[PDB]
Amino acid sequence: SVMEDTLLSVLFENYNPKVRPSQTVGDKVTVRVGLTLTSLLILNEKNEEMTTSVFLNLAWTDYRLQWDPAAYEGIKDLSIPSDDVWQPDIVLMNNNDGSFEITLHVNVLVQHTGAVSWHPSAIYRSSCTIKVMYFPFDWQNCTMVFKSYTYDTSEVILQHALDAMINQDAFTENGQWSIEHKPSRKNWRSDDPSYEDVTFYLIIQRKPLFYIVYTIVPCILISILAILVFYLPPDAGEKMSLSISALLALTVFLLLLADKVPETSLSVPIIISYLMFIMILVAFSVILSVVVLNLHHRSPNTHEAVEAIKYIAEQLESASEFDDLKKDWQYVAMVADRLFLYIFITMCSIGTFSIFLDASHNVPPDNPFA
Amino acid sequence: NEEGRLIEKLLGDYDKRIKPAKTLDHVIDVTLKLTLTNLISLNEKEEALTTNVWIEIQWNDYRLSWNTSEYEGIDLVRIPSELLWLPDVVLENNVDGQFEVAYYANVLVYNDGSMYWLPPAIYRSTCPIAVTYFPFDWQNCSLVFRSQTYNAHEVNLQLSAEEGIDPEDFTENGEWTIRHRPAKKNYNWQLTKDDIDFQEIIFFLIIQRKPLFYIINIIAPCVLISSLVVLVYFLPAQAGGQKCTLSISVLLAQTIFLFLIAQKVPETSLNVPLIGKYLIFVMFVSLVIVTNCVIVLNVSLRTPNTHSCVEACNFIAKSTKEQNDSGSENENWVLIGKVIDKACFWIALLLFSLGTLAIFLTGHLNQVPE
Amino acid sequence: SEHETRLVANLLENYNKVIRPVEHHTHFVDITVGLQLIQLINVDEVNQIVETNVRLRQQWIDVRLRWNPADYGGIKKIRLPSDDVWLPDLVLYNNADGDFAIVHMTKLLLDYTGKIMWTPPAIFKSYCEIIVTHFPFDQQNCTMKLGIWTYDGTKVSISPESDRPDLSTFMESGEWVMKDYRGWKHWVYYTCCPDTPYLDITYHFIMQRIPLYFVVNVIIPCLLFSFLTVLVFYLPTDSGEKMTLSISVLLSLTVFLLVIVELIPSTSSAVPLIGKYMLFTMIFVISSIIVTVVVINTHHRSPSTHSAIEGVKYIAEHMKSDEESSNAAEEWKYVAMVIDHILLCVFMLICIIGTVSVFAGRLIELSQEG
Amino acid sequence: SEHETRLVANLLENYNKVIRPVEHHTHFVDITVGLQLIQLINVDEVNQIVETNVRLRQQWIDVRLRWNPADYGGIKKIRLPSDDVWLPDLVLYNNADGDFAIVHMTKLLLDYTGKIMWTPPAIFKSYCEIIVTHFPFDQQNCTMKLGIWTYDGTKVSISPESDRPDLSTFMESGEWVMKDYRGWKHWVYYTCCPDTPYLDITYHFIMQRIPLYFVVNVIIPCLLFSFLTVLVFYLPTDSGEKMTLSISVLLSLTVFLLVIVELIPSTSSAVPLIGKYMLFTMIFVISSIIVTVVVINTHHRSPSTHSAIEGVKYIAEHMKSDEESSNAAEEWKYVAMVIDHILLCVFMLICIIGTVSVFAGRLIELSQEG
Amino acid sequence: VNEEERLINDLLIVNKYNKHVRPVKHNNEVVNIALSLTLSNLISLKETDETLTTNVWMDHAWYDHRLTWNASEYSDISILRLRPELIWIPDIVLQNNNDGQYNVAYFCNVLVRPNGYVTWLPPAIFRSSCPINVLYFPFDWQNCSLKFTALNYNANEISMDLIIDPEAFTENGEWEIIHKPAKKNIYGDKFPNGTNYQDVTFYLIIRRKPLFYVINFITPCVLISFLAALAFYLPAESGEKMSTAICVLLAQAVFLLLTSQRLPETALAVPLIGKYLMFIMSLVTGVVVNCGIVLNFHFRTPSTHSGIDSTNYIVKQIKEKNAYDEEVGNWNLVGQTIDRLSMFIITPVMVLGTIFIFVMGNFNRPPAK
């Protein structure tokens, strides 16, 4: 009773819905912003698009809602729909690639002397620079800048919790990636009067090892038929034609591979590294098989009286066997041996190279997890 | 000039949902017209389209002719949507999607009570293009639209030219073309047996298409293909013995290519419309290509195999010579190529005929509807 | 005039729309519902989705709408805005995949008595069985039940009105054809609860599907592939000298149909059918494989066809006689006789299992055709 | 205090939001537009659609917003939210594919005098020419008009604000690159009506396309194929032993060219490149075609290649000699003298066609690069 | 009329009743709220990303003490309707599966009992991120956990107490529903200094995998394998089909490669385990290897891969001489090795082929354990 109807009344009589919990132009209302992440569902590492979900915990004080006996001293804590406070119509300078879901228009926790607690989980369409640099083992970092899209920091100050909180705090276990750390730094670019956005850093690490495995098999298994086509010459010289069949076959195979590679990066591309040199490794088996094909080509051919008849017989046979013996002199196997071992150098050299680069790529550019 | 009082006077009596109908037995005079401006999606196989239509809306309601303070002030007024009779438009046969930006827009109230309004609308519809619209003779797109709310005994729509156009702003990036747009103003009585006519707006659109890009992708390959098979056909007379199988390699290659085509453009017609006439010449000129093609191997299949002590022994050896000769003789009576050579000219003129039958007829199915 | 203001004002005050015209503890609210289907713009047999239009003919009564010379007297039948009506949350039980569209903001039929109807040109997306047994020749009847959503019998009741076919306005551009369409009513009380539950209209769509496009191309490559198989068998007789050639065409053949089955899975899972069907193709074609298995295995089935001066004349003709009986050996294996049994052995067996394929295929359509 | 409540309330009461600050019958409401694309998110040259960042600077004056010491004296310039404001129905003429995003419920600033700015952070959906002339090396100028949508130069007028580049915030992630962009003002009066119509801002986007990755993959299998066809020339003249062997390649390679066709037309369909680009491939690719067919038909062009005891000796020797003849005949068939001709015949052809292909390539690259 | 006008004026739902005020008899323990979960349908499953779109009947109950009516409300009709804005509605949040706001399970018609007890239960088309993990593929196919409850209120403003999942499991799913337990609870946490919001915890333990991919996929293996199997039987019956035998490698090779290509495609659409994916590609490689083996083994060997008297002696010389050549080749033939090859092909196929379904079983036995 104690002026309850009265209080109750006066409050709703004088209280202003559309007003800011501050008095004039000054230090403003110090709103607390801090989100406990739920998990993340889709990383479009290719366009640098980020759809995650977290809690929008906001909290500041409404010294305009401090109650009295019944709602203050009666029930120190009571729930009341928002819709009555300035809400950070927050957009993300890079990210905020789309609207809020479970972000605004939801109830809030209002304390006795005016404290306000609003904890809503939400899904948000963002876009961070995971750029086409989300695959190097050295990976990269990003700028996630949150802030309102009609308000300018003049009638409120934004403030954070931790900066180490981490993003693996609610990292998706469903992620083909992994994370090292999440930096959180408060910002106010001076290119705009409006103090604004906060930059949040993603020192992301995404190592999904699954198909590069059977990709290796081509390179090496194709090599099987490759070393084979380079081995088949002094193995079965008649490989002559069958050889060409091999490369038709070998080339179509690698071209189909050419088919799956562009359409697969089509959703998760970054630096060429792997492709850069396998591209070379490609060109390598490609041309090596084709010049060996020219190795194959280079051969212009390969690619008394009684006794007289006898004598005429003696000369017939012998005469042309030298001729076909000439073909021997012409297609001997010197080259095959020499370049099948130049094949030895080439393929085992260029092989242990990307082997190496790849080797160097996973270990060397790994520690910049920062 | 009573400016305030007048506004306040009518608004007193101002009636929303009531039509400016003098009385109830002669309806109101409603004017409408549409200027196409965007034909956004042509999915003819399903007979649907999306267009930005200028919904020219006009009618009469002197319920607000004004005085010196509003009529005379300016013979022109722009008053909000929700403030006068509004035709909830839709295309009987087409509009399959509620109008977008076609309503809730500023209307126009001159001074005598003339009302003009014209919102732009992107919406979905379903015109003809029913197993036809892909010819050279075109199916006239007939869209009739009217208010879907009341029926002509209270409402009456007007129109204008039924002779003059859809190509007024027909899109230049369309894979088609328009040649005429007729439009009639009419009463309501359909196949379904509905009475009390609510007048509507008929939209004829007989348009052309077929600006083939795929044509010569189809025309040069087939000639290359025909020649390839005619290679198969004449190449044998030129080709060595190791060519029978040579020819085969081509059949394999020839149809690998073939059904791959059969898979390529069939896809084409499913994502877009469809029609069988042009379809008939291809697959059957194609099946004949295949026919005489396998016929060829069955042709390079046909034939049986082409697919004193001194003298006693001189006697018998002179026999292996004549003996084997009888054998090589076999080859003779078997491979005297009357059928093959002639098979070249067989397919040749047959080629000319299949071609003439087809391109001559393609000449016709472009020339009757020309 | 005629109690002008007194009549419309009184009507608004003591009139309510949230309420339903409940009349004592009995038959519920007499709801009359029906399907008036005149267009089926889009449907997918695969996902069993249907976006069609059916004017929701509703019919029921509310005495409160009865009037005297001051509303009935005004103009017999008057049409009131739907708002005043308690609109049921009707919905497609195992369907309802989409909102009904165009029902809101519409006209309502009122009578001097009270009779009322409102047929809304409702268009919506549906969801009913088609399963893999949707498109056979023997059809399936999509069970479509419709009735009040969240209201139980104790408050509202609906009932059929008339029988009307599904083909009354069925899509002539459909990839299917109808046979019959029946709709009977019922009330469903459940063993769960002792209560008397909602009423509903159950439609059953009986119609056979499948255009013949997929059909023409399944069997063409089959007969054509049976031509090369037929060649497969005939060649060793007319050109066994190309057994290897045969090999090439099996790599050809095999890849082609292995690729044919690729199409199947895409198309089949892209357009639904009862698996029992592909079973036909399965063994029939594994039959060409099982048979080429044996036949070319059998084709390659054979070991390798897959004075003193008087003296040497004798060492010599000896040289020749040894080899001659030897060449007789390789021909001793390619007897050119079993080759004719294999094509005839299988020609009959393919003419028979083909006729077997032909059998259930035609038997099933001597069932469908019906 | 200072007429505190009397201040604030008075203002609310006599002020109609919807009223447009019309000042006598003249100047119309002078309102200026000023678009600053902060950045672009994504574009589809094929479908000519772009999602862009726009801060719309909208200016106008409402002499009704001027104040004295009780509004301006309170705090010079202040923040008043939109709502109360008459928002010009801004619209991109031949564009406009989407609603302005974040135009709604934002705020504006009122000066001690009245002048107001409305500059809400937009990003929206656009629609500009690209025509099949945008992907050129010679680009096309995206014609984009902006201006007042439903109001005339007599009711209102949209004017420009300044010059600024489009590459000022052009997307570095675009598959295209900018040349320049300018925008000048205009007033559109139509010969239709004798009246003075709306004003407009016309954008001109001059940018040239094609990211370079594409460049490398495609021209290299061409010089690739060039060498195989190059080998197609040298392989035969230096070794006619694997003519059929190359039969293989001809199959493997045009099919390679065939499958490259699926890939790049979808590119073609993925990105609109001026068709005259297509002819490059046309004759180029097709000469691979005409050359083969002749080269390989010619490759193919060759008939079959692609005392008494003493007398015994002479009847026998005579046998060896005329077959001696015969051998030379078929070799008199496949000569190595003109295969050399075709080698330089066409290699000059290829260096001609090639250098001719390089011609227009180089030529308009002499125009584009500028 | 029995005080009806007056009484609903007494309740005035919106005006007299505090709809923005939840009748929890003021600050105390809580309003006894109860949630009931019944899945009406499961339309889509995404095993790979642990996401599910499913329909639920959001059966809700709580007593509205200000809702109790009198004669012309209560007894006039011991049951009546009242919209959401005129009925207190729990703010049920799908705790770990509402990362996709609830549809038409929102502000819907509710059921008004006579003595305040109210009943609101409409349909929920929802999306969830259920505990798939890369362990939702072994045969147990995990247990999908979900919690439902009134999000906003705590343990002194709300108490929610507590149906099979296969009750409306979708029959067009590529999986199988084995069980679905239901038990409510309440729980505070470390950072919170008080207990609150009670919830409906419903675990769904399911299983899935086709008996169809097995069909057309192993099918080609025994068919293909017989080719490679015959491959070694065929080197005997006629190894002379050198080039043509070579053709088949190209051909059995291109077949092999894209077969594996279709594999990841469906793979990405499905998070496949490492255990199974290897047996597939391991064994096709087994043939791939032996195709390469086929290569060499098929082309592996170096070669197999007195005057008148004077003259004819010349020939007997040329005779014998190239007879040495002729034979230098059969030296290479290596034919008494033939059977052992295809015998030691049989043995291994048996070894590995068995090793797989041997392993098939050694893991087929323990789950059935």
Automatic annotation (TrEMBL), chain A:
<comment type="similarity">
    <text>Belongs to the ligand-gated ion channel (TC 1.A.9) family.</text>
</comment>
<comment type="subunit">
    <text>Pentamer of two alpha chains, and one each of the beta, delta, and gamma chains.</text>
</comment>
<dbReference type="Pfam" id="PF02932">
    <property type="entry name" value="Neur_chan_memb"/>
</dbReference>
<dbReference type="InterPro" id="IPR006201">
    <property type="entry name" value="Neur_channel"/>
</dbReference>
<keyword id="KW-1133">Transmembrane helix</keyword>
<dbReference type="GO" id="GO:0004888">
    <property type="term" value="F:transmembrane signaling receptor activity"/>
</dbReference>
<feature type="transmembrane region" description="Helical">
    <location>
        <begin position="240"/>
        <end position="258"/>
    </location>
</feature>
<keyword id="KW-0770">Synapse</keyword>
<feature type="domain" description="Neurotransmitter-gated ion-channel transmembrane">
    <location>
        <begin position="215"/>
        <end position="356"/>
    </location>
</feature>
<dbReference type="InterPro" id="IPR006202">
    <property type="entry name" value="Neur_chan_lig-bd"/>
</dbReference>
<dbReference type="InterPro" id="IPR036734">
    <property type="entry name" value="Neur_chan_lig-bd_sf"/>
</dbReference>
<keyword id="KW-0407">Ion channel</keyword>
<feature type="transmembrane region" description="Helical">
    <location>
        <begin position="209"/>
        <end position="233"/>
    </location>
</feature>
<dbReference type="InterPro" id="IPR036719">
    <property type="entry name" value="Neuro-gated_channel_TM_sf"/>
</dbReference>
<keyword id="KW-0813">Transport</keyword>
UniProtKB/TrEMBL annotation, chain B:
<keyword id="KW-0813">Transport</keyword>
<feature type="disulfide bond">
    <location>
        <begin position="127"/>
        <end position="141"/>
    </location>
</feature>
<keyword id="KW-0675">Receptor</keyword>
<keyword id="KW-0812">Transmembrane</keyword>
<feature type="transmembrane region" description="Helical">
    <location>
        <begin position="212"/>
        <end position="234"/>
    </location>
</feature>
<dbReference type="GO" id="GO:0095500">
    <property type="term" value="P:acetylcholine receptor signaling pathway"/>
</dbReference>
<keyword id="KW-0628">Postsynaptic cell membrane</keyword>
<keyword id="KW-0732">Signal</keyword>
<dbReference type="InterPro" id="IPR036719">
    <property type="entry name" value="Neuro-gated_channel_TM_sf"/>
</dbReference>
<dbReference type="GO" id="GO:0045211">
    <property type="term" value="C:postsynaptic membrane"/>
</dbReference>
<dbReference type="Pfam" id="PF02932">
    <property type="entry name" value="Neur_chan_memb"/>
</dbReference>
<dbReference type="GO" id="GO:0004888">
    <property type="term" value="F:transmembrane signaling receptor activity"/>
</dbReference>
<comment type="function">
    <text>After binding acetylcholine, the AChR responds by an extensive change in conformation that affects all subunits and leads to opening of an ion-conducting channel across the plasma membrane.</text>
</comment>
<dbReference type="InterPro" id="IPR038050">
    <property type="entry name" value="Neuro_actylchol_rec"/>
</dbReference>
<keyword id="KW-0407">Ion channel</keyword>
From TrEMBL, chain E:
<keyword id="KW-1133">Transmembrane helix</keyword>
<keyword id="KW-0406">Ion transport</keyword>
<keyword id="KW-1003">Cell membrane</keyword>
<dbReference type="InterPro" id="IPR006202">
    <property type="entry name" value="Neur_chan_lig-bd"/>
</dbReference>
<comment type="similarity">
    <text>Belongs to the ligand-gated ion channel (TC 1.A.9) family.</text>
</comment>
<keyword id="KW-0628">Postsynaptic cell membrane</keyword>
<dbReference type="InterPro" id="IPR018000">
    <property type="entry name" value="Neurotransmitter_ion_chnl_CS"/>
</dbReference>
<dbReference type="Pfam" id="PF02932">
    <property type="entry name" value="Neur_chan_memb"/>
</dbReference>
<keyword id="KW-0675">Receptor</keyword>
<feature type="transmembrane region" description="Helical">
    <location>
        <begin position="211"/>
        <end position="234"/>
    </location>
</feature>
<keyword id="KW-0770">Synapse</keyword>
<protein>
    <submittedName>
        <fullName>Acetylcholine receptor delta subunit</fullName>
    </submittedName>
</protein>
<dbReference type="InterPro" id="IPR036734">
    <property type="entry name" value="Neur_chan_lig-bd_sf"/>
</dbReference>
<feature type="transmembrane region" description="Helical">
    <location>
        <begin position="341"/>
        <end position="361"/>
    </location>
</feature>
<feature type="disulfide bond">
    <location>
        <begin position="130"/>
        <end position="144"/>
    </location>
</feature>
